[PDB]
């Protein structure tokens, strides 16, 4: 069995290997990359996502989210308070302000210490989940707006034609902006490209050990657990590496820098934080190996998780028994 310790693997494809996206994912899995839940892909040196980032400041963040924490430093939830719209140029200036900017630090490990010590005492503002793309249309390789769609994969594997679309999302971050512990909708893959700015630190639990994280989360968030049998789908809970180590949960960590891709694999729980002003693009995707994960994915039916139009068909076709209850949660 390849990668039996479930370490995060880092890949350096050549420009030739960068042509066929599906083939490269399948290659990485042949080497055991999925066992970690997360992999890093460094694009070939010849590749670029677009020519420059000089003209992005007029993109609108219609609903910036202030991430307000509750709990203790290593075990907390966050809620998202909606703020007034602002442009990317306005948000960059805010991220760089004395109130929100990255503190002085020695290295990524020092910054990680400072994040876990201090995150809860601040409420950073995240421009998340903005439909759109920063890939130039002429970028033919690993262009996250030109991937094969999940609907077409389901149709190719299973023969059923379904409605829905699959488009990318932009994330504009600042110091301390936080992504809570989650797997993807329907336990899909994700791919994330850091277009510019400061790094993003990731934490990940191997898919084979995801239920260990779930059982800890039910212990640590006991009211949330009573409210919903899949409350990590709400995407609000944080647990620090120190707490994970104290409770024996297997995980790994890695820092993504500008110009690098990360892939999350089906049922790979992940969480993380931004080091400073940055912009990432991400999208979900599927492969043949996902289908079985999709059929077994948990679902929130309490009403909190509320998701896209296109998840309807995935539930309806892969999980017909759950469909009725889940749809009640969506309505
Ligand atoms: O970058 C972020 O805030 C969150 N991204 C992801 O969870 C992802 O790409 O799967
Ligand atoms: Mg612009
Ligand atoms: Ni994710
Ligand atoms: Zn729920």
Curated annotation (Swiss-Prot):
Cofactor or coenzyme needed: Fe(2+)
Subcellular location per the Swiss-Prot or TrEMBL entry: Nucleus
Origin: domain of life: Eukaryota
Any one GO biological process: positive regulation of double-strand break repair via nonhomologous end joining
Catalyzed reactions per annotation: N(6),N(6),N(6)-trimethyl-L-lysyl(9)-[histone H3] + 2 2-oxoglutarate + 2 O2 = N(6)-methyl-L-lysyl(9)-[histone H3] + 2 formaldehyde + 2 succinate + 2 CO2
Annotated ranges, domain JmjN: 8-50
Binding, Zn(2+): 228, 234, 300, 302
GO MF term set: chromatin DNA binding; damaged DNA binding; histone demethylase activity; histone H3K9 demethylase activity; histone H3K9me2/H3K9me3 demethylase activity; metal ion binding
Chain positions with PolyADP-ribosyl glutamic acid modification: 16-17
Gene Ontology, cellular component aspect: blood microparticle; chromatin; nucleoplasm; nucleus; pericentric heterochromatin; site of double-strand break
Predominant localisation class: nucleus
Residues of the signal peptide: none
UniProt domain JmjC: residue ranges: 136-302
E.C. code: 1.14.11.66
Amino acids binding 2-oxoglutarate: 126, 192, 200, 235
Enzymatic class: oxidoreductase
Function, in words: Histone demethylase that specifically demethylates 'Lys-9' of histone H3, thereby playing a central role in histone code. Does not demethylate histone H3 'Lys-4', H3 'Lys-27', H3 'Lys-36' nor H4 'Lys-20'. Demethylates both di- and trimethylated H3 'Lys-9' residue, while it has no activity on monomethylated residues. Demethylation of Lys residue generates formaldehyde and succinate.
Protein name: Lysine-specific demethylase 4D
Organism: Homo sapiens
Gene this chain is encoded by: KDM4D
Residue span relative to the full protein: 11 to 341 of 523
